[PDB]
Amino acid sequence: SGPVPSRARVYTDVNTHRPREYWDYESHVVEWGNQDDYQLVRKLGRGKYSEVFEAINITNNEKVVVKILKPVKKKKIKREIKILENLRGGPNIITLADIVKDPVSRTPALVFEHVNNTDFKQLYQTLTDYDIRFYMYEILKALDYCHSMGIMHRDVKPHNVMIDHEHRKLRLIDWGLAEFYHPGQEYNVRVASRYFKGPELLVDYQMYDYSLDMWSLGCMLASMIFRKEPFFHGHDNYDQLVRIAKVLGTEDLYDYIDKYNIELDPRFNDILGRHSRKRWERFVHSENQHLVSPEALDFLDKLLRYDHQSRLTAREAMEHPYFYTVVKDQARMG
Numbered sequence: 001s002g003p004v005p006s007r008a009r010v011y012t013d014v015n016t017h018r019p020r021e022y023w024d025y026e027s028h029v030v031e032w033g034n035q036d037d038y039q040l041v042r043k044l045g046r047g048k049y050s051e052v053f054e055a056i057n058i059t060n061n062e063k064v065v066v067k068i069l070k071p072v073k074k075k076k077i078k079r080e081i082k083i084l085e086n087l088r089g090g091p092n093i094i095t096l097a098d099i100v101k102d103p104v105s106r107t108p109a110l111v112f113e114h115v116n117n118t119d120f121k122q123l124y125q126t127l128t129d130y131d132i133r134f135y136m137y138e139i140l141k142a143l144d145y146c147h148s149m150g151i152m153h154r155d156v157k158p159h160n161v162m163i164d165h166e167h168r169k170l171r172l173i174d175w176g177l178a179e180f181y182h183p184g185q186e187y188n189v190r191v192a193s194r195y196f197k198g199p200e201l202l203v204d205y206q207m208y209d210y211s212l213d214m215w216s217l218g219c220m221l222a223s224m225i226f227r228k229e230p231f232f233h234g235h236d237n238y239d240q241l242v243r244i245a246k247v248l249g250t251e252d253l254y255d256y257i258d259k260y261n262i263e264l265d266p267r268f269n270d271i272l273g274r275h276s277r278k279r280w281e282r283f284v285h286s287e288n289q290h291l292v293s294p295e296a297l298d299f300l301d302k303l304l305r306y307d308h309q310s311r312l313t314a315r316e317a318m319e320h321p322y323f324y325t326v327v328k329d330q331a332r333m334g
């Protein structure tokens, strides 16, 4: 009888209550700036980021960052720009300063604010227990904000989290896969990187929502406190679900599948087989001991749920005891 419909628990009708021009990016007329205002200085990313440059705005001598976009469809260009513009000014969202196009090649490029970067993938050797809690909370600020603005990021991972550890600042970047949430809409499941894909993507359930981002966040958290990168290390798309199943157990997976009347490939059921749930305690060793706590484990348990509707919202997450002291400390110092 086909899959059972699903709706976001929160922020369900955000885009519905806003004017059409807010979310209808296909009708958005892009107002391009002048590329001549910007001169490229050098390459950024140290070999991990393509077509990202430090640049200078010669109209005010301000240092900026330029990302040159890969040849995708015009529709996806409008989408990213529209979303960045709608989210501009939000807490811990990267700030789009301008958009330009090359005179002759007509190659589009985004101009961002300049922020220092100690790569999140290279920062776990000097990251204490409090540090992980702090930065996780900052990520949640961004996710709660964009969700409340009717937007799913759909590509949450360490690579897309820029961290300036000196000033303890954080920015969520690369909104190229982001989309607007509309209740009842079916979305493409070919999003996110394999290690951070939620179960809904891996079983081809298209009517997902903001909670997708919360799974990805759980994967990041698991990786950092257990010192295992990535935590769910699938070698292909089937193996990704298998390795999730080896931790969460197959019992809750099949219940999830039945709940939304999802139909898997016949061979997939044989592949998944039968696995018991591992207690989160079993991934703790003497070298990740100092990053693990009862509240950390409880928090992780409530993010990594098969059922996307059962996962904590960003706001629910921010009020979890895992952040109790972090919240108190931030509220009296800044």
Ligand SMILES: O=C(O)c1ccc(-c2oc3c(Br)cc(Br)cc3c(=O)c2O)cc1
Residues within 6 Å of the ligand: 044, 045, 049, 052, 065, 067, 094, 112, 113, 114, 115, 116, 117, 162, 173, 174, 175
């Ligand atoms: O939306 C994007 O795809 C997107 C990519 C890179 C930056 C981006 O990257 C930096 C890197 Br990589 C190194 C250093 Br140092 C600084 C930045 C920076 O300030 C900055 O905005 C921002 C946004």
Ligand SMILES: [Cl-]
Residues within 6 Å of the ligand: 179, 186, 187, 188
């Ligand atoms: Cl989509």
Ligand SMILES: [Cl-]
Residues within 6 Å of the ligand: 231, 232, 233, 234, 243
């Ligand atoms: Cl694994």
Ligand SMILES: [Cl-]
Residues within 6 Å of the ligand: 010, 143, 144, 147, 210, 313, 314, 315
């Ligand atoms: Cl949320």
